[PDB]
């Protein structure tokens, strides 16, 4: 009850900033996550014994893949923490609880392969879940871990609060399916401009939480350049392995996944910043003005990729 988590001075300060990096010390990531729950939610939201046991079971069910790993999980959870702390009063007690857990869990048991590769491989998961294949699996893995003995961090919620929080988490994880980002943002764009956006409209809130999840999930592009650039290597390490596996299936991968077309990466980053990242953080800032630092940081990194192409690095 009286057992707070504290961090060294530099982390205590830097963790409040959108562009915070959680560092290379794996054994501090759980403390960082608990620290963020205690300040975001209260020291009372979860039983510490249960939370800690949930955290370690979630860590166990992330795999040793280059990018979609335990570090990504905690990175995406921190970006959600930053958004929630900068938007203190827009979010219910349940939503703050559900979303940090949703982020920690959003990529559970990822193998480093796109929904596309699952379908072309004819993976059993593609039979069981036709759309948002990996994202339905991640939610399913979250519900499994929540049903382990001693792992129900939600136990003190009423039957109906409990169904609301599992429903917040399900939508939050499904929304990290980038194929659903485009329509989700176009709708949010129309609603904010025509002026119809209404945060008491649950179907509207859902879309806004959906965009937050895309924003947190993509937060690699909102770090300081050296973090962004070094994360790019891990993302491409997965992309190129998937390409190698596509060629094993007798399918020329798209250039993004073809390690022969490394040359074309800087241009590909540009596309993605222009087509996905900038529009995403633009719409997020329009709805949640205090999330502007994510837009600025993303713009700075777009400018860093333009420099790469021009031979200035
Ligand atoms: C991790 C991923 C699931 C979602 N994600 N999180 C952060 C970032 Cl960054 C991304 C992402 O998607 N990065 C992209 C997106 C589109 N691309 C296209 C090319 C490319 C390259 C060479 C030739 C041609 C094209 N490269 C791309 N890289
Ligand atoms: Mg994912
Ligand atoms: Zn992710």
Task: Indicate the DSSP class of residue 273.
Answer: I
Give the residue numbers marked as catalytic.
68
| Nearest CA-CA partner of 47 in 147, 143, 155 | 155
Q: Give residue for tokens 């770090």.
A: 223
Query: Solving technique for this entry?
Result: X-ray
Helix (H) or strand (E) holding 305: helix 292-309
Say if CB 203 and CB 136 are below 8 A apart: no
Q: Is 182 in the pocket of ligand 1 (CB under 6 A)?
A: no
Q: Give the DSSP per-residue string, 195-258.
A: S---TTSHHHHHHHHHHHHHHHHTGGGGS-HHHHHHHHHHHHHHHHHHHHHHHHTT-PPPGGG-
Q: CA nearest 212: which of 55, 95, 69? A: 95
* In contact, 7 and 13? CB cutoff 8 Å: no
Angle at which helix 178-193 crosses helix 278-287, to 10 degrees, equals 40
CA distances from 246 to 67, 117, 234, 243 (A): 19, 7, 19, 5
**Domain extents for the chain?**
28-310
Q: Is the CB of 274 under 6 A from ligand 1?
A: no
Ligand 1 atom nearest residue 232's Cα:
9
| Alpha-carbon gap, residue 215 to 258, rounded angstroms | 26
**Measured torsion, CA atoms of residues 227, 288, 169, 235, in degrees rounded to the nearest 10:** -20
15 contacts: CB under 8 Å, gap ≥ 6: 7, 32, 35, 36, 78, 81
Task: Give the angle subtended at the CA of 284 by the CAs of 189 and 232, to the nearest 5°.
Answer: 115
- C-beta of residue 22 within 8 angstroms of C-beta of residue 75: yes
Please say whether the beta carbons of 273 and 221 come within 8 A: yes
> Alpha carbon 45 to chain centroid distance?
22
CA distance 189 to 195: 10
Instruction: Report the residue among 117, 216, 268, 276 best suited for mutation to probe ligand 1: largest number of ligand atoms under 8 A from its CB.
Output: 268
Cα–Cα distance measured from residue 3 to residue 201, given in angstroms and rounded to the nearest whole number: 38
CA–CA separation, 132 vs 176, rounded Å?
Answer: 9
**Are the C-beta atoms of residues 165 and 154 closer than 8 Å to each other?**
yes
Half-sphere exposure of 242 (CA within 13 A, CB side): 25
State which residues have CB under 5 angstroms from ligand 2, the bound ion. Answer: 107, 176
Contacts of 115 (CB under 8 A, 6+ apart): 126, 131, 132, 133, 134, 177, 179
180 lines ligand 1 (CB under 6 A): no
Binding-site residues for a divalent metal cation: 72, 106-107, 217
Surrounding ion ligand 3 within 5 Å at CB are: 107, 217
272 lines ligand 1 (CB under 6 A): yes
**24 burial level (CB within 10 Å; 0-12, 13-18, 19+):** exposed
Q: Which of 180, 223, 269 best tests ligand 1's pocket when mutated (most atoms within 8 Å of CB)? A: 269
Phi-psi group of 131: left, alpha or beta (phi > 0 → left; psi -120 to 50 → alpha; rest → beta): beta
Give the separation between CA 171 and CA 211, rounded to whole angstroms.
11
Of the candidate CATH numbers 3.90.1150.170, 3.20.10.10, 1.10.1300.10, 3.40.50.720, the domain formed by 28-310 belongs to: 1.10.1300.10
Ligand 3 midpoint to CA 48 (Å): 26
Q: Which atom of ligand 1 is nearest to the CA of 262?
A: 22
Nearest CA to ligand 1 atom 5: 218
- Record the tokens describing residue 186, joined without a space: 């176009």
Q: Residue 20 and residue 140: Cα distance in Å, rounded? A: 30
- Is the torsion defined by CA of 40, 43, 46, 50 positive or negative? positive
CB of 270 within 6 A of ligand 1: the answer is: no
Residues 6 or more apart in contact with residue 257 via CB below 8 angstroms: 239, 240, 242, 243, 246
Ligand 3 center to 3 CA (angstroms): 31
Distance in angstroms (rounded) separating the CA atoms of residues 113 and 124: 14
DSSP class of 90: S
């Amino acid at each position: 009850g009286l057992m707070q988590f504290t961090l060294p001075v530099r982390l205590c300060k830097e963790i409040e900033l959108f562009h915070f990096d959680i560092g290379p010390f794996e054994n501090m990531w759980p403390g960082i996550f608990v620290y963020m729950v205690h300040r975001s939610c209260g020291t009372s939201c979860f039983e510490l014994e249960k939370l800690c046991r949930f955290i370690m079971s979630v860590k166990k069910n992330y795999r040793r893949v280059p990018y979609h790993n335990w570090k990504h999980a905690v990175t995406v959870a921190h970006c959600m923490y930053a958004i929630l702390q900068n938007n203190h009063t827009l979010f219910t007690d349940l939503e703050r609880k559900g979303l940090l857990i949703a982020c920690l869990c959003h990529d559970l048991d990822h193998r480093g392969f796109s929904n596309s590769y699952l379908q072309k491989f004819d993976h059993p998961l593609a039979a069981l879940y036709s759309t948002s294949t990996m994202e339905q699996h991640h939610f399913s893995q979250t519900v499994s871990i929540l049903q382990l003995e001693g792992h129900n961090i939600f136990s003190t919620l009423s039957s109906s609060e409990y169904e609301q929080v599992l429903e917040i988490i399900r939508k939050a994880i499904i929304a990290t399916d980038l194929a659903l980002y485009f329509g989700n943002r176009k709708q949010l764009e129309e609603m904010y401009q025509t002026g119809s956006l209404n945060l008491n409209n649950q179907s509207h809130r859902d879309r806004v939480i959906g965009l937050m999840m895309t924003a947190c999930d993509l937060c690699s592009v909102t770090k300081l350049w050296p973090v962004t650039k070094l994360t790019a290597n891990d993302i491409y390490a997965e992309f190129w392995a998937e390409g190698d596996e596509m060629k094993k299936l007798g399918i020329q991968p798209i250039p993004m996944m073809d390690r022969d077309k490394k040359d074309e990466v800087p241009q590909g980053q540009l596309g993605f910043y222009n087509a996905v990242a900038i529009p995403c953080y633009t719409t997020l800032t329009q709805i949640l003005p205090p999330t502007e630092p994510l837009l600025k940081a993303c713009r700075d990194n777009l400018s860093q990729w333009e420099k790469v192409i021009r031979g200035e690095e």
